[PDB]
């Protein structure tokens, strides 16, 4: 959370494995894995979304047999904050791996290449 | 402890019999078969035994190799507008018969896969032009990997896909692969869809094929010829063989009956009557 | 690291000095780090078909009869 | 025999837009490759081909306004047509395959073609 | 000594008991008994949800009618219970389903009748489509009939209207509706339901899929096809009718991956 | 040393966790933390339903709005729960059923606001009608909201419509909606979310009742009520406004007598 | 003594809990 | 001079006299003095990813406050 001190506020970010209609509203999200997060003096929340899958490995493509599910921030209050202090700010995002995470299966990468 | 080229049972010496004991009456019902020897209807005699199974066991039964697709290619007059001269083929064993059927008798199978390529070549308008030997290129793009646009574009640098530079004339190709499947083992048959239809969706976006999954995506073999264009035209083939080593297989099925049609089990009509005629009491 | 096995003999040539007789064994050695690599032992095993051909819950002993 | 019916061909002005269709009589259980050709002169031209799903290739004339798709279960494939130009006149066909990503004028057979005519000003 | 018997049985799950005088033994497919996932064998993390006694019990499906002309009948697991109670309820909450059943046929005559239904488990029972324009193109809806189940034809008739194709499964009878021969199915986990001897027939399926746990409502694991191997006739009679009730109920079934409920579109 | 706090908590339970800073303890009811049914204390003889992690988890009931005016809001266990995944179905199921809860009371604001609420959880929490005519009347329906929940008001109005009476409760808040003074709530478990101290409440209770198993669908073991004891005030605004939201996961509940599901009439 | 080889950590069972322990909160300020 | 290291095996023949149990191994040879010649072993080490993870001078302690 990148707002100011005086800023307070409660989030629920949301992990919904796949194969249901993907959480438009809170009232969905909040049935799969979640977590609420209480902004703070620690300025930063952790989800892990944890491995829940069908097949062993899942494809590196968009692909549905090995389809991942959804993930989702909603409000669970709101954000408030007092007088002379901006309404509007800004989160920031991070993706990482966990100690039980592997990959498979080298091969050519789509993002880059040589016109000619 | 038993081996597949172990001797099978010795037959052993049985007399008459007169008594309550009746293996030959059974129920089928029960789902069960009757084990029954040769003795338990008749007399026998002391046979040492010294047939064994040792060529019907999984490994021995899938030893063979077999060709899967003929992947072609071919050149013009000149350039004149085209210079698309590439194959690409989607890697599945679902092409032909024999090799498919084989892999039918059961459910599901794990193995090591060995393929070999033979690679061959030849003229098209009689002509005193001269070929010098080719070099072929096999590369193999998994699933998700840039697919060849033109023949001479990046994507043939190969820098991380395995590829196999074939030169014209040795001894043929070949690499082996190991249990590359997304499960614990493959599938040679799924009874459902890749996509749950929503209510809340449209019919479309919810649409899959029956009996299709990403369980056997494995990928495409792109091939080309290395050489630069010739003035003479030189058309090749490469004809892939599989053979399916440290084999595992589970779940035993009744084998395809009538023709095999598309990738699914699918039938056609006029191939549904496999047997012939015969009467009842004709030997 | 060579692996040696026995071969079963089939067709024996006059000899025991040599061939036929004194177990004729095979030599093998593993030259890549991949397994998938490796050639077919086909040293494999067999196994009572029972799974698939009694596979009723209470034991089938043949003498007797089967519904009882 | 084996049979390819080309439709929705018509006379349109520049700038246009088509999308002509072909499918097979009965199923094909072999082929998986289909391509569209045109002609105008007495040279045939390929113009675009599709395999399966969802590798597509074009030529250098065709790309970018022209767009090939067909279904990964029926044999059956389309050719989107758009900012269609007064070059593009001619005669379209269709044709199956085998494995064949690239194209060349060698088909066994032939069905019959649709008409395209682009009209200019 | 007591009267013990192959033929008398009582089978016990959750909150139902289902009783016979006349059985056949029953059969554990494959010899394997059902049971939860091992954690050598593991995939999904997060704690699964195991229902037992809410899930693991009887539920008897609609009952079905057996005349003359009855070509055969077949079910998909586990697709047929997709809406009996808690068991249907986990199935579609969570991404993630296994489960093994007890599958017991029911179907009952009179010394004075004869026939022969040939009861089969086949695991990953893919069935032939009906048309000859378009392969697997039969819809999730004509694939899961749930409950109602669906039929085996004596005939293959090729949809023909291309323009709104029926998508369905043309499933014949002496092919299996799969193309192979039924003389074969044989060597699916099976029972056979004669008149004369017995009037059921019990099938104790594991879950059995390439996977440890896979999703319950994109994939059956298992099939029931039930097929007359000898046609039904009654004292002399044209045209006699029996019933057929199939009760079925999962076993060591266990759930991963908890979200909104899924809302299938089944029509 | 390391920095842990009675403001800074973390509650995970099945597939969700919650966070938070500004916490000020969190109370046990009682001293009783939730239990399953004791052999030595059991009532059904049925083997019971556990679901464990399929219910035994965070839901998140609508989030209401605190003004100036509010009067305070009223919930009640299991019925506000009566639509939440799983746990709804598994009791709508079951005849009876028993289980321990954890409710978080969510409300945050600013170091410039100022106001405080009173979270108790009554056992029994039985309120007062609408009527002057009849006693005892409010109907099924009103009597039990689900999770919208109903409010608490400032002045008793008797319902005088006695061709069509409302049946309805009208709680009167510092009679605490059940004709007792406001000011002993405290005697029930509870907590003060104080605005310039903490931003939530946390009780979590046992379950209570004079059985060891009860239906659920007709009695609400414990009642959550949420009144304003200093009014909401900020900056030098008229009116300011500020969500609460309730988050509440059952507890080691169990179920008994399985049957086909209770369809009842809510509305 | 790891190789590239060797299993990754296994999953080990957790119940509930409800502590003054908080592995969710952090601060990437730190740069961890 | 010989090396014969083992192979991680992954698909199992149905073998146990032969192949797939009893420790597959594999053997190398170097025939060249220089080691650039070498081909590669791939018997690799892997190491705790702190050093990018968690680069922090004071250790951190998961289930405590970060800041503190
Ligand atoms: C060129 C190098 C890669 C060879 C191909 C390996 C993977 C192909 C998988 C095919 C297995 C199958 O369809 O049965």
């Known amino acids: 959370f990148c707002g100011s001190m005086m800023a307070t506020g409660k989030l629920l970010v949301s992990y919904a494995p796949p194969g249901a209609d993907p959480p438009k509203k809170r009232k969905e999200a909040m049935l799969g894995t979640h977590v609420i997060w209480d902004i703070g003096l620690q300025s930063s929340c952790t989800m892990v979304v944890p491995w829940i899958s069908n097949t062993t490995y899942r494809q590196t493509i968009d692909d549905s047999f090995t389809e991942g599910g959804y993930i989702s921030v909603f409000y669970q209050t709101r954000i408030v904050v007092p007088l002379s202090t901006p309404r509007e700010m800004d989160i920031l995002g991070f993706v990482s791996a966990c100690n039980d995470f592997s990959v498979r299966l080298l091969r050519d990468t789509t993002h880059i290449e040589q016109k000619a | 402890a038993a081996t597949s080229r172990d001797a099978l049972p010795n037959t052993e010496a049985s007399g008459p019999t007169h008594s309550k004991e009746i293996p030959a009456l059974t129920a089928v019902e029960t789902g069960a078969t009757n084990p029954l020897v040769p003795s338990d209807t008749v007399q026998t005699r002391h046979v040492v035994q010294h047939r064994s199974r040792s060529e019907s066991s999984i490994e021995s039964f899938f030893a063979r190799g077999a060709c899967v697709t003929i992947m072609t290619v071919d050149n013009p007059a000149s350039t004149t507008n085209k210079d698309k001269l590439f194959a690409v083929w989607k890697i599945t064993y679902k092409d032909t018969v024999q090799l498919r059927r084989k892999l039918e008798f059961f459910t599901y199978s794990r193995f090591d896969m060995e393929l070999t390529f033979v690679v061959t070549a030849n003229f098209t308008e009689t002509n005193n032009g001269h070929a010098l030997n080719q070099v072929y290129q096999i590369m193999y793009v998994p699933p998700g990997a840039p697919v060849p646009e033109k023949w001479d574009d990046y994507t043939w640098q190969t820098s991380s896909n395995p590829s196999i530079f074939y030169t014209y004339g040795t001894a043929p190709a070949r690499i082996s692969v190991p249990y590359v499947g997304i499960s614990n083992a493959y599938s040679h048959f799924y009874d459902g869809f890749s996509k749950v239809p929503l209510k809340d969706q449209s019919a479309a976006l919810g649409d899959s094929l029956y009996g299709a999954a990403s369980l056997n995506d494995f990928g495409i073999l792109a091939v080309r010829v290395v050489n630069d264009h010739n003035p003479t035209k030189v058309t090749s083939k490469i004809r892939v063989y599989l053979k399916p080593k440290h084999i595992r297989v589970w779940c035993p099925r009744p084998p395809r009956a009538v023709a095999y049609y598309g990738p699914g089990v699918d039938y056609k009509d006029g191939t549904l009557t496999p047997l012939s005629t015969k009467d009842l009491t004709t030997y | 690291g060579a692996q040696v096995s026995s071969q079963k003999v089939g067709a024996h040539e006059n000899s025991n000095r040599a061939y036929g007789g004194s177990t004729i064994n095979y030599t093998t050695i593993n030259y890549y780090r991949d397994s998938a690599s490796n050639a077919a032992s086909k040293q494999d095993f067999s196994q009572d078909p029972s799974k698939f051909t009694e596979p009723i819950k209470d034991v089938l002993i043949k003498t007797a009869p089967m519904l009882n | 025999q084996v049979q390819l019916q080309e439709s929705g061909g018509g006379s349109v002005q520049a700038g246009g837009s088509l999308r002509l269709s072909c499918a097979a009589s009965?199923?094909?259980?072999?082929?998986?490759?289909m391509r569209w050709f045109r002609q105008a002169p007495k040279e045939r031209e390929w113009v675009a081909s599709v395999?399966?799903?969802?590798?597509?290739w074009h030529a250098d004339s065709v790309k970018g306004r022209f767009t090939i798709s067909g279904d990964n279960a029926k044999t059956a494939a389309y050719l989107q047509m758009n900012s269609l130009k007064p070059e593009d006149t001619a005669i379209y066909y269709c044709?199956?395959?085998?494995?064949?990503?690239?194209?060349?004028?060698?088909?066994?057979?032939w069905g019959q073609g649709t008409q395209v005519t682009v009209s200019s000003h | 000594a007591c009267g013990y018997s192959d033929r008398v049985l009582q089978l016990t799950l959750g909150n139902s008991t289902i009783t016979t005088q006349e059985a056949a033994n029953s059969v554990v497919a494959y010899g394997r008994w059902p049971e939860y996932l091992r954690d050598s064998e593991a995939n999904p993390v997060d704690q699964p949800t195991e229902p037992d006694v809410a899930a693991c019990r009887f539920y008897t499906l609609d009952t079905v009618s057996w005349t003359k002309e009855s070509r055969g009948w077949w079910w998909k697991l586990p697709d047929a219970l997709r809406d009996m109670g808690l068991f249907g309820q986990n199935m579609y909450y969570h991404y993630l389903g296994r489960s093994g059943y007890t599958v017991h046929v029911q179907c009952n005559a009179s010394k004075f009748h004869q026939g022969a239904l040939g009861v089969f488990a086949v695991p990953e029972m893919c069935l032939a489509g009906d048309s000859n324009t378009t392969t697997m193109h039969t819809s999730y809806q004509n694939a899961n009939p749930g409950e109602k189940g669906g039929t085996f034809t004596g005939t293959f008739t090729p949809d023909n209207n291309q323009t709104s194709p029926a998508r369905r499964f043309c499933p014949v009878d002496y092919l299996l509706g799969n193309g192979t021969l039924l003389g074969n199915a044989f060597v699916f986990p099976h029972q056979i339901i004669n008149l004369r001897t017995n009037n059921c027939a019990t099938l104790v399926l594991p879950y059995v899929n390439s996977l440890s746990i896979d999703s319950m409502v994109k994939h059956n694991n298992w099939g029931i096809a039930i097929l007359p191997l000898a046609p039904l006739n009654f004292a002399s009679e044209s045209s006699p009718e029996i019933p057929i009730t199939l009760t079925i109920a999962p076993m060591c079934c266990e759930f991963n991956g908890l979200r909104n409920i899924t809302l299938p579109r089944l029509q | 040393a390391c920095g842990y706090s009675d403001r800074v908590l973390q509650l995970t339970l099945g597939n969700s966790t919650i966070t938070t800073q500004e916490a000020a303890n969190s109370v046990v009811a009682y001293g009783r933390w939730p239990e399953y049914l004791r052999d030595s204390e059991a009532n059904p003889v049925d083997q019971p339903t556990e679901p464990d992690v399929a219910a035994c988890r965070f839901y998140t009931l609508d989030t209401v709005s605190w003004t100036k005016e509010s009067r305070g809001w009223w919930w009640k266990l299991p019925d506000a729960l009566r639509d939440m995944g799983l746990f709804g179905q598994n009791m709508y199921y079951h005849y009876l059923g028993r289980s321990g809860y954890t409710v978080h009371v969510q409300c945050n604001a600013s170091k410039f606001h100022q106001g405080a609420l009173g979270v108790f959880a009554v056992p029994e929490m039985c309120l007062a009608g609408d009527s002057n005519t009849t006693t005892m009347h409010t109907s099924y329906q009103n009597a039990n909201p689900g999770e919208k929940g109903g409010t608490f008001t400032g002045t008793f109005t008797p319902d005088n419509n006695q061709t069509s009476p409302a049946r309805r409760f009208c709680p009167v808040d510092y009679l605490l909606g059940n004709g007792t003074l406001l000011g002993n709530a405290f005697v029930f478990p509870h907590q003060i979310i104080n605005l310039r101290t903490n931003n939530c409440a946390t009780l979590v209770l046992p379950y209570v009742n004079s059985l060891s198993i009860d239906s659920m669908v007709k009695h609400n073991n414990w009642g959550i009520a949420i009144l304003p004891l200093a009014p909401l005030n900020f900056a030098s605004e008229s009116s300011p406004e500020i969500p609460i939201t309730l988050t509440i996961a059952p507890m080691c509940c169990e179920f008994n007598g399985l049957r086909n599901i209770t369809l009842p009439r809510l509305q | 003594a790891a190789t590239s080889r060797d299993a990754l950590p296994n999953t080990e069972a957790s119940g509930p809990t409800h502590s003054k322990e908080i592995p969710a909160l952090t601060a990437v300020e730190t740069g961890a | 001079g010989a090396q014969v290291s083992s192979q991680k095996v992954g698909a199992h023949e149905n073998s146990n006299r032969a192949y797939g149990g009893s420790t597959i191994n594999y053997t190398t040879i170097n025939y060249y003095r220089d080691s650039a010649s070498n081909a590669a072993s791939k018997q690799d080490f892997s190491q705790d990813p702190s050093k990018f993870t968690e680069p922090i001078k004071d250790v951190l302690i998961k289930t405590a406050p970060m800041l503190n």
């Open positions: 044709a199956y395959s085998n494995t064949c990503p690239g194209a060349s004028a060698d088909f066994r057979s």
């Open positions: 395999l399966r799903g969802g590798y597509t």
């Open positions: 009965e199923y094909i259980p072999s082929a998986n490759c």
